[PDB]
From Swiss-Prot, chain A:
Ubiquitinated by the anaphase promoting complex/cyclosome (APC/C) in anaphase and following DNA damage, leading to its degradation by the proteasome. Ubiquitination is mediated via its interaction with FZR1/CDH1. Ubiquitination and subsequent degradation prevents entry into mitosis and is essential to maintain an efficient G2 DNA damage checkpoint. Serine/threonine-protein kinase that performs several important functions throughout M phase of the cell cycle, including the regulation of centrosome maturation and spindle assembly, the removal of cohesins from chromosome arms, the inactivation of anaphase-promoting complex/cyclosome (APC/C) inhibitors, and the regulation of mitotic exit and cytokinesis. Polo-like kinase proteins act by binding and phosphorylating proteins that are already phosphorylated on a specific motif recognized by the POLO box domains. Changing K166M: In pincer mutant; loss of centrosomal location and decreased interaction with phosphorylated CDC25C and BUB1. The modification Phosphoserine is found at S3, S78. Changing W42F: Loss of centrosomal localization and of S-phase progression. Induction: By growth-stimulating agents. The gene is PLK1. This is Serine/threonine-protein kinase PLK1. It is found in: Nucleus; Chromosome, Centromere, Kinetochore; Cytoplasm, Cytoskeleton, Microtubule organizing center, Centrosome; Cytoplasm, Cytoskeleton, Spindle. It is linked to Defects in PLK1 are associated with some cancers, such as gastric, thyroid or B-cell lymphomas. Expression is cancer increased in tumor tissues with a poor prognosis, suggesting a role in malignant transformations and carcinogenesis. Residues 164-166 are annotated as: Important for interaction with phosphorylated proteins. The modification Phosphothreonine is found at T126. The POLO box domains act as phosphopeptide-binding module that recognizes and binds serine-[phosphothreonine/phosphoserine]-(proline/X) motifs. PLK1 recognizes and binds docking proteins that are already phosphorylated on these motifs, and then phosphorylates them. PLK1 can also create its own docking sites by mediating phosphorylation of serine-[phosphothreonine/phosphoserine]-(proline/X) motifs subsequently recognized by the POLO box domains.
């Protein structure tokens, strides 16, 4: 649904939400669109192993450098492994093929580091069945200013390094959650931002998001 | 940065 996201961003940006009359950003909030999942923590160890991350439900995942993925559900034991060719298999930390020993060890290190050392993004929010299929990290990249995280449920999260602000874009809800410098977490319907406007700070970040979605679309493999 | 906040 990246193409849908691109269309939704074209539409909001074309409405020039910060450049017209009275901004009524609060009227664009839609609590029914609060995301179910976002990335709460991440560790870039890609020069050796991969990108580890925690989702807001306390599950963790790793996208390894060989393009395989391991997902640990928040029960702390149930695992999903996704091979290069896309085959999904289910196992546990306690019961797994010997061939997965190294990758499970790596996941445990990532999980323990994130639990001990990093702040949980969106920590005050209850999100929207903890064994139901989790989204996984489809791809990610970094720029000088941000990390861009594309989840398999279509959501795209952009974390800006310098000011700690974040966007969570969902093309199914056609919504964006903005986490500002004060850690206020607010979810907007994109078409209501068109209707009611928004501040220049959110508008600028939505222009950046469109450029990042074009990058995702032009680099999918 | 090589990890989140």
């Amino acid at each position: 649904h990246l193409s849908d996201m691109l269309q939704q961003l074209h539409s909001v940006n074309a409405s020039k939400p910060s450049e017209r009359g009275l901004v009524r950003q609060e009227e664009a909030e839609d609590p029914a669109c609060i995301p179910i999942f976002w990335v709460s923590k991440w560790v870039d160890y890609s020069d050796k192993y991969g990108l580890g991350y925690q989702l807001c439900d306390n599950s963790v995942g790793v996208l390894f450098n060989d393009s395989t993925r391991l997902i640990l559900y928040n029960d702390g034991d149930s695992l999903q492994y996704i091979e290069r060719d896309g085959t999904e298999s289910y196992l546990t930390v306690s019961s797994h093929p010997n061939s997965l020993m190294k990758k499970i060890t790596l996941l445990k290190y990532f999980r323990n580091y994130m639990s001990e050392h990093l702040l949980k993004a969106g920590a005050n929010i209850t999100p929207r069945d903890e064994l139901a299929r989790l989204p996984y990290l489809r791809t990610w990249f970094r720029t000088r200013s941000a990390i861009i995280l594309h989840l398999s449920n279509g959501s795209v999260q952009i974390n800006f390094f310098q000011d700690h602000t974040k966007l969570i874009l969902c093309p199914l809800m056609a919504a964006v959650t903005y986490i500002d410098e004060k850690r206020d977490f607010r979810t907007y319907r994109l078409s209501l931002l068109e209707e009611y406007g928004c501040c220049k700070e959110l508008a600028s970040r939505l222009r950046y998001a469109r450029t990042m979605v074009d990058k995702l679309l032009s680099s999918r493999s | 940065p090589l990890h989140s906040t």
